[PDB]
Curated annotation (Swiss-Prot):
Superkingdom, natural source: Eukaryota
Record protein name field: PAN2-PAN3 deadenylation complex catalytic subunit PAN2
Provenance organism: Saccharomyces cerevisiae (strain ATCC 204508 / S288c)
Function according to Swiss-Prot or TrEMBL: Catalytic subunit of the poly(A)-nuclease (PAN) deadenylation complex, one of two cytoplasmic mRNA deadenylases involved in mRNA turnover. PAN specifically shortens poly(A) tails of RNA and the activity is stimulated by poly(A)-binding protein PAB1. PAN deadenylation is followed by rapid degradation of the shortened mRNA tails by the CCR4-NOT complex. Deadenylated mRNAs are then degraded by two alternative mechanisms, namely exosome-mediated 3'-5' exonucleolytic degradation, or deadenylation-dependent mRNA decaping by DCP1-DCP2 and subsequent 5'-3' exonucleolytic degradation by XRN1.
Record-annotated disulphide pairs: none
Localization: Cytoplasm
Written domain comment of the UniProt record: Contains a pseudo-UCH domain. This ubiquitin C-terminal hydrolase (UCH)-like or ubiquitin specific protease (USP)-like domain is predicted to be catalytically inactive because it lacks the active site catalytic triad characteristic of thiol proteases, with residues at the equivalent structural positions that are incompatible with catalysis, and it cannot bind ubiquitin. It functions as a structural scaffold for intra- and intermolecular interactions in the complex. The linker, or PAN3 interaction domain (PID), between the WD40 repeats and the pseudo-UCH domain mediates interaction with PAN3.
Subunit-structure text: Forms a heterotrimer with an asymmetric homodimer of the regulatory subunit PAN3 to form the poly(A)-nuclease (PAN) deadenylation complex.
Binding annotation for a divalent metal cation: 52, 54
RNA sequence: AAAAAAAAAAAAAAAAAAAAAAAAAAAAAAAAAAAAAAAAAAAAAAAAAAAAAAAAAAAAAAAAAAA
């Protein structure tokens, strides 16, 4: 007879949005970069960001339609 | 002086009651009266009376991605 509770009722860390953390450390192709958030550009409600992920498939399948499991993907790249 | 054994094996034996013409009664309206194996012998399952079965449930997808 206990109730459930959400993390929206809680207090969440956000600073990983406001920094980078990566174990590659090469950080090359330094273009107009994956520029880090600060709290002047802190995220809001109702606001919009764009997002695009590129995928790769990792599964071998069978014929499956003829009158080893059906192929599914995984993520390869993300640009937000 | 018709005076018989007084019951094995749970023996064995009673009935717990009638046409009534007693008086001047014709010839089946019964509802059906109705026996044969035994030479290695007769042999339904499904669930069992259609006294009224309309019986295509629309379709159309121009095509993906994901640079
Ligand atoms: Mg596409």
């Amino acid at each position: 007879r206990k109730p459930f509770f959400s993390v929206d009722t809680y207090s969440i860390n956000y600073d990983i949005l406001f920094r980078d953390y990566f174990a590659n450390g090469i950080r090359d192709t330094a273009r107009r970069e994956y520029k880090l958030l600060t709290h002047d550009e802190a995220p809001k409600s109702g606001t919009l960001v764009a997002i695009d992920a590129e995928f790769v498939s990792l599964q071998s399948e069978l014929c499956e339609i003829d009158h080893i499991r059906p192929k599914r993907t995984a993520l390869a790249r993300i640009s937000i």
